[PDB]
Amino acid sequence: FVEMVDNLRGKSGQGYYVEMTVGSPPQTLNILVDTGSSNFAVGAAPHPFLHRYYQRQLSSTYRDLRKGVYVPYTQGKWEGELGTDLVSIPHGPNVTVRANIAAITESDKFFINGSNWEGILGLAYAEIARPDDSLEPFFDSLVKQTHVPNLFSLQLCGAEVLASVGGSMIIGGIDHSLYTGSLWYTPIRREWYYEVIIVRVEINGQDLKMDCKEYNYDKSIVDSGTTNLRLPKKVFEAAVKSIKAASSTEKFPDGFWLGEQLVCWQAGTTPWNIFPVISLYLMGEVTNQSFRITILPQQYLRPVDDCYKFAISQSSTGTVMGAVIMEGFYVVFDRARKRIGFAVSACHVHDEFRTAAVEGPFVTLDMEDCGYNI
Numbered sequence: 001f002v003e004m005v006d007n008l009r010g011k012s013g014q015g016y017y018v019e020m021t022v023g024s025p026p027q028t029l030n031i032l033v034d035t036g037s038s039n040f041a042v043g044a045a046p047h048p049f050l051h052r053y054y055q056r057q058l059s060s061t062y063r064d065l066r067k068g069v070y071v072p073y074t075q076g077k078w079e080g081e082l083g084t085d086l087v088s089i090p091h092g093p094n095v096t097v098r099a100n101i102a103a104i105t106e107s108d109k110f111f112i113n114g115s116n117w118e119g120i121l122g123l124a125y126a127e128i129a130r131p132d133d134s135l136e137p138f139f140d141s142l143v144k145q146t147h148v149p150n151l152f153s154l155q156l157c158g159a160e161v162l163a164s165v166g167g168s169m170i171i172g173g174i175d176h177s178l179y180t181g182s183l184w185y186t187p188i189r190r191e192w193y194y195e196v197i198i199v200r201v202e203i204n205g206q207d208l209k210m211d212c213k214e215y216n217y218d219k220s221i222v223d224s225g226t227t228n229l230r231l232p233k234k235v236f237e238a239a240v241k242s243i244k245a246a247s248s249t250e251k252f253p254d255g256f257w258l259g260e261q262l263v264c265w266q267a268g269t270t271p272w273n274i275f276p277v278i279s280l281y282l283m284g285e286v287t288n289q290s291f292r293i294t295i296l297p298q299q300y301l302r303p304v305d306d307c308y309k310f311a312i313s314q315s316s317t318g319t320v321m322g323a324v325i326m327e328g329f330y331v332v333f334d335r336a337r338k339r340i341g342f343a344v345s346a347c348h349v350h351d352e353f354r355t356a357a358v359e360g361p362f363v364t365l366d367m368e369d370c371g372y373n374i
């Protein structure tokens with residue numbers, strides 16, 4: 001899938017984007033790859049933080065759906081107008097799709113100063129599309145209209161101005177040069193978000209010993225459009241307590257653990273070995289099995305002297321496996337078989353003593369009971 005390798009770029013903390021073209025003649029736009037939402041939405045009018053935007057009037061193939069869409073979330077919102085147009089991904093498959101597009105005409109706290117992207121590609125399912133599930137998402141259109149197999153995979157690599165990060169979005173298959181070792185799969189629990197089930201969490205090999213329902217309260221999702229590992233309140237608190245203890249040899253301000261303040265060390269002296277590894281055990285395809293993905297401090301301390309923000313934060317909407325978990329790994333969104341695969345990434349972080357890992361099986365009792373009953 002050689003022409004698709006290295007087709008993602010971004011700035012640390014501001015997401016990964018892919019170049020796309022919209023309309024005829026093609027308008028080039030950078031689009032954030034977001035497995036946590038399901039709309040294809042593009043800035044369509046001027047904005048302080050947008051260096052270009054989609055101009056429907058310049059496109060001979062635009063069709064207006066005469067329908068508005070409002071997408072409030074927090075910390076923000078966007079609104080716009082629905083239509084269809086022809087869409088292609090230059091460093092993607094060699095196809096062109098007529099896709100729904102939300103042309104964003106007003107927004108608050110959505111576009112990001114300096115991020116270099118002008119729209120979002122929601123890769124999750126129709127159930128969470130706005131205004132409702134009848135607005136076919138981009139990937140659904142791509143699969144229906146072209147032969148492309150119903151699967152994509154993401155290799156996010158990450159790590160003055162914020163550091164540039166890179167990676168690859170492989171549409172339609174699995175590129176075996178982007179990973180090493182075995183691919184382990186966890187089931188997609190429900191096709192809305194990419195919802196999965198975490199059955200155990202360890203911090204430096206010590207079980208947090210919570211009821212596993214706590215890890216998925218109210219859901220756990222894999223989300224390339226969120227930077228941090230976000231954990232439900234009780235789990236977050238348990239985790240930081242444990243990380244504090246392992247690293248207690250040093251002391252950092254409260255704002256660092258709140259992910260607000262940076263912590264800096266003389267360049268090159270970053271004391272990685274005082275921070276523990278974190279293992280998340282995901283439910284396997286076999287009911288009583290799991291496998292673990294182990295992440296290093298190189299993933300959960302985000303570069304911003306060498307300066308870092310702690311990139312684990314509290315959630316009130318369940319666990320979010322964001323970019324800093326995904327950067328460990330090659331992640332396969334196997335929609336056709338309703339499962340998500342993980343393997344150690346050719347661009348994983350590691351030092352001479354430790355490395356990200358994907359290991360299994362571990363046998364674990366009653367993990368169907370680790371979910372939330374809708």
Ligand SMILES: N#Cc1cccnc1N1CC[C@H]2OC(N)=N[C@@]2(c2ccc(F)cc2F)C1
Nearest residue numbers: 034036037038071073110111128223225226
């Ligand atoms: N839109 C939308 C949307 C539609 C449906 C569900 N969730 C959405 N969110 C959730 C909050 C963020 O988390 C994710 N994954 N994407 C969001 C996002 C992305 C980029 C950015 F700059 C700002 C953002 F808030 C938008």
